[PDB]
Design a binder for this molecule. Structure first.
Ligand SMILES: Nc1nc2c(ncn2[C@@H]2O[C@H](COP(=O)(O)OP(=O)(O)OP(=O)(O)O)[C@@H](O)[C@H]2O)c(=O)[nH]1
Ligand SMILES: Nc1ncnc2c1ncn2[C@@H]1O[C@H](COP(=O)(O)OP(=O)(O)CP(=O)(O)O)[C@@H](O)[C@H]1O
Ligand SMILES: Nc1nc2c(ncn2[C@@H]2O[C@H](COP(=O)(O)OP(=O)(O)O)[C@@H](O)[C@H]2O)c(=O)[nH]1
Ligand SMILES: [Ca+2]
Ligand SMILES: [Ca+2]
Ligand SMILES: [Mg+2]
Ligand SMILES: [Mg+2]
Ligand SMILES: [Mg+2]
Lengths: 438, 422, 343, 54
């Protein structure tokens, strides 16, 4: 058994971690007061769920998580929420003045005053680990804290834990729910300084989650609560192999091996299905072939892009529910003859399948309906580079006029770091085109 | 996160008094300071403008400044006069005589340190001070001359706090003295340097709205102050109620100010009725962007919006709000600069203002605001080319060079707005 | 009131479409770099498809199909026909082609010589043609063709040595059909085609009578404009010639094979370019080019992704584009033949 | 169509199906950049206080 520490930075990171750990407890049967009746080993153990939970003498199962926000309004909801008894106050770090949607303010100005406090609280959780795998970092691209402080944390984590892996869960900025105009700046500033420090990053475009909630859940104006419950399902599918018995993606190193052959191209595309509204009284249960075919529909992806015009480097199928290997191969054979699936010539055309018999858990009273089987596909396609092109274009538009740049220079940041970051993204876009286009 | 409010001069105090009268009703605060509301949203962000005292009393975090005792004695005797902290009344006796030099260099310099002691006392007890907001007119002496003096000294003591102002622009249509363009030009240069956000409230627009739209044939200052009251309440809604967009002063400045000197906003309000008819969301948005419903007396079709901040208040379809906002941008995309993607941001509040089922407040950073500065500059040069009325200012120690520089500082500001309009 | 942008000034087709949209009073043109558009008349090279379909409250439409270059490139068309099972290695309506890379650069040099030696071993017509997307040589010797390509990717296919020759004149020609595919992947064939004819008599033994390009017939040919105006014969006159000379019609003898080729090519790439469930929609006008032999058999020469219409047919075709491809998505306030198929 | 490396257990099973074979900065450097930005803030603030002193 090897432990994993989750880190939640900024409002988006905290509220998404708040929804994931809620879903984690419902899956592992953990109650809000940390008690787990099915855990017969009191006060310790090396089970597969102990990779995400520590155990106390009283029998409480404490999440191996750290919450960091530069202003205390969001984590105060976790301090007084339903699961206030899971965490101890050492895991919840709050400041008093946020980064104000300014990357430089969260990285240089305010991040410096609190970086040594966060690492000390992370070291307290690492000292309870007999064999630390690494870290799972939850943050947003557009926020000043989610972008500014995360990149500073990812730099120090490589210094203090060089042999450990680090995975990201990133929220790509979408204007339908965005709160700042300079989010294209923050997203590219934080991707530049974190690219060499992240081994595998799962991007989640809020634009896709928003429309999935509008289209498949009949939600008129989706809120953050709607978006975060759907995101936690995707995150739960990705981390299910670390929390349950199995043989696929059993540790963090296996994520980089099975999904990242090229280090810089470490942004797998996540597609999830089925998303059924709990308001529908009776829905026809989708089969294995129907939910695997939905993994190749762009309307179900976390980022809207076209994998038909882009080559694959890896592909994982994570099934949860009534799924057997025979039905999987029958679906893959049918899909291969009716879809445009192109792999790079230096990679095998194949799929790594993972089946967990426990069907997906739904939050009671939530928006997602209970299904008998579901699948999350992790595909490293060069088509996700469209998200960088959209982001890099909005960057070039504003930076040509040096708009809002004075806010970043006023926090001690140099103007040259802007072009230095954009030149790195220009190289990232070029690396995708060499792999995906002929 | 607290905000320290300051009101200076006759116009600053009469407008600020009505502002505290309007928002105290929205938060359920009576003229004595006791809370008598029915919703928890009224108190959730009450600390932004109110200090909690003994007996659960809410005292406004306001400082009342003037060089004459006249206007402040009317505020203390007004409806909500007994709610202001008595020590926060700082006033002289000589007056400013509509002279910027008297407020900024002589009479106001004798009183500015007294004011800064109350400013300091209010900031010392703040857990997290966002900054300051100042209400004043630019055409007078105290609010213009001493107001900009306070802004300059507050920035020296609080350099990392946001400076917000509600500045009333003088107009020949609503004019007290002829030296008003002199005071405005001198104060505009101070605002270009030492403020982060300035709401340009043109008395010409306030007059035209009261006359053409509200059908008031003889508008008074009280009628004009009613529009400022409803506008100041709307522009501060995101600060006084729980929300995601533009929650504090700094985040508002980051979304609205792309260049540090172009921070002068055109405020707009909707509806403006002379009254029981319900207003649909499409109607709120069309009137909100209409030139007739804005307080700057500028034509947006003569410029381009750099950034826009919209606020809808009331129980309405947030889905329909998004559709109408996207419809104004997609059907008039020639008036929003294309080199700032998604420059329009919309927030929704559930609590409407008094007397309206639903309303909408417009905050625009448009390059058409140069029309306001061009107008003031034209009225300034008309007198300055003959050195007319300068003896009122040179008699207080000023030199003609300081006027020439202030003239050049505003012509540069006008040129900078024209740079980004093309 | 709809909006649209223009990112290709050299487009003679969509310049008229942009003129017709403004004439309706319900379309407003924006700057070429404005993102708040309903329609994009994009450029040929490096069209930013990744930035389409990401504007809330805006149904976006583009006049090009992403991935359609697989059909509109010389090397891509040959690779698509051989590898696609729907078209198969044995294709009756496509001339035997081969992809040949220059020696200074997969390649099919050894495979092209295998079929060439079979045509040398058995006494058959062994005249081929070399061409590319960027200069054409027609030689019966394979050594002259391979030495010429070495002097970018090229393709060598069998040259039709027995083409259908119009009389009087005894001359070569080709047929251009304009095909429009809307967002629903309906295939519309314009009822009006053009016969780009040569004015010189075909000499099976100088590449003027062998090449029917418009620019070559206007510069190198001597009898340009003698038989028909601008070396362009429309379908009404050509139908009359087939009835008078060959006792057949254009619909039966030629148009059935043409409509069959258009369906097969577009249905093949449909799963790869279809914007049925995509966040943006695509339509595209195509220009199919055909060669007819003396046996009245139709062969596919190439497909054009940015075709130019005939002068007489600009008004009618561009109006049909607005009706079925633009106003079908953005309604306001038939000249095509629909080629039905199983989606 | 080959299925390899099948691992079964109580909670599920995993395998792999193949369709076709193929064809850091130190803490010293970070503190320097963090203190260089704080120095540019102190310089810009000192120049502001000097401008206000005039
Ligand atoms: N999916 C999701 N996205 C969020 C959530 N909260 C904020 N975002 C997105 O994150 C971006 C802003 O990042 P924030 O997390 O709010 O900012 P921050 O990390 O707190 O940093 P500060 O600027 O200091 O407040 C916006 O584009 C939002 O769309 C959330 O709860 N769920
Ligand atoms: N295999 C073949 N057999 C007989 N004739 C052929 C041939 N390939 C080409 N030709 C003739 O040569 C001409 C050139 O064809 P091609 O389509 O390659 O040129 P092009 O693409 O530059 C003009 P366009 O853009 O109008 O199609 C054709 O008009 C055709 O008449
Ligand atoms: N809207 C409004 N404008 C005012 C009011 N009082 C004065 N003004 C304007 O402000 C200018 C006079 O400034 P004044 O308040 O006398 O300056 P003071 O000496 O600092 O008090 C004139 O141009 C007036 O138009 C008021 O109550 N409401
Ligand atoms: Ca245990
Ligand atoms: Ca005195
Ligand atoms: Mg925050
Ligand atoms: Mg007065
Ligand atoms: Mg061509």
């Amino acid at each position: 058994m090897r432990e994993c520490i989750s880190i939640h930075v900024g409002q988006a990171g905290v509220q998404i971690g708040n929804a994931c750990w809620e879903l984690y407890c419902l899956e592992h049967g953990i109650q809000p007061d940390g008690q787990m009746p099915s855990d017969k080993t009191i006060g310790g153990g090396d089970d597969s769920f102990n990779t995400f939970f520590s155990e106390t003498g009283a029998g409480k199962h404490v999440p191996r998580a750290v919450f960091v926000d530069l202003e205390p309004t969001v984590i105060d909801e976790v301090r007084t929420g339903t699961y206030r008894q899971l965490f101890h106050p050492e895991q919840l770090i709050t400041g008093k003045e946020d980064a104000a949607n300014n990357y430089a303010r969260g990285h240089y100005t305010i991040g410096k005053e609190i970086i040594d406090l966060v690492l000390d609280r992370i070291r307290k959780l690492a000292d309870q680990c007999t064999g630390l795998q690494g870290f799972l970092v939850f943050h947003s691209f557009g926020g000043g804290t989610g972008s500014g402080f995360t990149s500073l944390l990812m730099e120090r984590l490589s210094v203090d834990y060089g042999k450990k892996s680090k995975l990201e869960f990133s929220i790509y900025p979408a204007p339908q729910v965005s709160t700042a105009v300079v989010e294209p700046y923050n997203s590219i500033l934080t991707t530049h300084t974190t690219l060499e420090h992240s081994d595998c990053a799962f991007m989640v475009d809020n634009e896709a989650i928003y429309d999935i909630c509008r289209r498949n859940l009949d939600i008129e104006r989706p809120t953050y609560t709607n978006l975060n419950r759907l995101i936690s399902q995707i995150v739960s599918s990705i981390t299910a192999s670390l929390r349950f018995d199995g043989a696929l993606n059993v540790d963090l190193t296996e994520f980089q091996t099975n999904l990242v052959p090229y280090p810089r191209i470490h942004f797998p595309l996540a597609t999830y299905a089925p998303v059924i509204s709990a308001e529908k009284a009776y829905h026809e249960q989708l089969s294995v072939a129907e939910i695997t075919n939905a993994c190749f529909e762009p309307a179900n992806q976390m980022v809207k892009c076209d994998p038909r015009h882009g080559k694959y480097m890896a592909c994982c199928l994570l099934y949860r529910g009534d799924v057997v290997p025979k039905d999987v191969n029958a679906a893959i054979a049918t899909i291969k003859t009716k879809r445009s699936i192109q792999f790079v010539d230096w990679c095998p055309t194949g799929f790594k399948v993972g089946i967990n018999y426990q069907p997906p858990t739904v939050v009671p009273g939530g928006d997602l309906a209970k299904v008998q089987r579901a699948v999350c596909m992790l595909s490293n396609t060069t088509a996700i580079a469209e998200a960088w092109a959209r982001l890099d274009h909005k960057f070039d538009l504003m930076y040509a006029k040096r708009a809002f740049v004075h806010w970043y220079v006023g926090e001690g940041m140099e103007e040259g770091e802007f072009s230095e970051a954009r030149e790195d993204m220009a190289a990232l876009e070029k690396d995708y085109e060499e792999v995906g286009v002929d | 996160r607290e905000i320290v409010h300051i009101q200076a001069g006759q116009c600053g105090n009469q407008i600020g008094a009505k502002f505290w009268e309007v928002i105290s009703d929205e938060h359920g605060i009576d003229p004595t300071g006791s809370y008598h509301g029915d919703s928890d949203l009224q108190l959730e962000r009450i600390n932004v403008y109110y200090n909690e005292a003994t007996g659960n009393k809410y005292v406004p975090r306001a400082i009342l400044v003037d060089l004459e005792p006249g206007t402040m004695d009317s505020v203390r005797s007004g409806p909500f006069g007994q709610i202001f902290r008595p020590d926060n009344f700082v006033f002289g006796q000589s007056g400013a005589g509509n002279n910027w030099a008297k407020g900024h260099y002589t009479e106001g310099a004798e009183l500015v340190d007294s004011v800064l002691d109350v400013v300091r006392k209010e900031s010392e007890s703040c857990d997290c001070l966002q900054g300051f907001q100042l209400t004043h007119s630019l055409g007078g002496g105290t609010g213009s001359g001493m107001g900009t003096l306070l802004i300059s000294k507050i920035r020296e003591e609080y350099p990392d706090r946001i400076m917000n102002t509600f500045s009333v622009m003088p107009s020949p249509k609503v004019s007290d003295t002829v030296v008003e363009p002199y005071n405005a030009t001198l104060s505009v240069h101070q605002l270009v340097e030492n403020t982060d956000e300035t709401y340009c409230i043109d008395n010409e627009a306030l007059y035209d709205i009261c006359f053409r739209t509200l059908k008031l044939t003889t508008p008074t200052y009280g009628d004009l102050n009613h529009l400022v009251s409803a506008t100041m309440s709307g522009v501060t809604t995101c600060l006084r109620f729980p929300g995601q967009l533009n929650a504090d002063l700094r985040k508002l400045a980051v979304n609205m100010v792309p260049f540090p000197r172009l921070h002068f906003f055109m405020p707009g309000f909707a509806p403006l009725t002379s009254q029981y008819r319900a207003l649909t969301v499409p109607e709120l948005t069309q009137q909100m962007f209409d030139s007739k419903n804005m307080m700057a007396a500028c034509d947006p079709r003569h410029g381009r919006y750099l950034t826009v901040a919209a606020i809808f208040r009331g129980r309405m379809s947030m889905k329909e709000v998004d559709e109408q906002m996207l419809n104004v941008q997609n059907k008039n995309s020639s008036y929003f600069v294309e080199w700032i993607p998604n420059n329009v941001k919309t927030a929704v509040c559930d609590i409407p203002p008094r007397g309206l089922k639903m309303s909408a407040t417009f905050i625009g950073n448009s390059t058409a605001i140069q029309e306001l500065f061009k107008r003031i500059s034209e009225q300034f040069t008309a007198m300055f080319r003959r050195k007319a009325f300068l003896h009122w200012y040179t008699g207080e120690g000023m030199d003609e060079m300081e006027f020439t520089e202030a003239e050049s500082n505003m012509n540069d500001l006008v040129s900078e707005y024209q740079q980004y309009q093309d | 009131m709809y909006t649209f942008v223009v990112r290709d000034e050299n487009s003679s087709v969509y310049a008229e479409v942009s003129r017709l949209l403004l004439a309706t009073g319900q379309w407003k043109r924006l700057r070429k770099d404005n993102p708040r558009f309903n329609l994009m008349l994009g450029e040929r090279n490096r069209l930013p498809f990744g930035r389409l379909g990401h504007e809330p409250g805006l149904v976006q439409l583009v006049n090009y199909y992403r991935g359609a270059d697989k059909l509109c490139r010389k090397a891509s068309l040959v690779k698509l026909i051989k590898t696609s099972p729907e078209l198969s290695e044995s294709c009756t309506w496509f001339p035997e082609s081969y992809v040949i890379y220059p020696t200074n650069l997969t390649d099919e040099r050894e495979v092209f010589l295998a079929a060439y030696n079979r045509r040398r071993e058995g006494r058959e017509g062994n005249v081929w043609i070399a061409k590319s997307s960027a200069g054409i040589l027609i030689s019966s010797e394979a050594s002259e063709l391979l030495d010429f390509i070495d002097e970018q990717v090229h393709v060598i296919q069998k040259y039709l040595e027995k083409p259908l020759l119009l009389e009087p004149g005894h001359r070569k020609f080709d047929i251009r059909s304009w095909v429009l595919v809307d967002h629903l992947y309906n295939i519309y064939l314009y009822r009006e085609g053009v016969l780009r004819t040569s004015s010189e008599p075909y000499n099976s033994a100088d590449k003027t009578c062998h090449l029917t390009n418009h620019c070559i017939q206007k510069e190198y040919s001597k009898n340009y404009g003698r038989y028909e105006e601008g070396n362009e014969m429309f379908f009404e006159e050509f139908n009359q010639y087939l009835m008078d000379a060959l006792n057949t019609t254009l619909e039966n003898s030629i148009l059935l094979q043409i409509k069959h080729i258009i369906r097969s090519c577009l249905m093949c790439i449909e799963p790869a370019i279809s914007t049925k469930h995509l966040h943006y929609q695509s339509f595209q006008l195509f220009g199919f080019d055909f060669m007819v032999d003396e046996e009245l058999k139709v062969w596919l020469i190439e497909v054009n992704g940015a075709p130019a219409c005939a002068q007489k047919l600009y008004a009618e075709l561009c109006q049909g584009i607005v009706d079925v491809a633009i106003s079908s998505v953005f309604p306001l306030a038939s000249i095509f033949i629909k080629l039905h198929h199983h989606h | 169509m080959e299925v390899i490396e099948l691992n079964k257990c109580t909670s599920g099973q995993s395998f792999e199906v193949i369709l076709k074979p193929p064809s850091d900065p130190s803490l010293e450097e970070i503190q320097k950049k963090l203190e260089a930005a704080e120095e540019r803030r102190k310089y810009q603030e000192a120049e502001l206080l000097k401008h206000l002193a005039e």
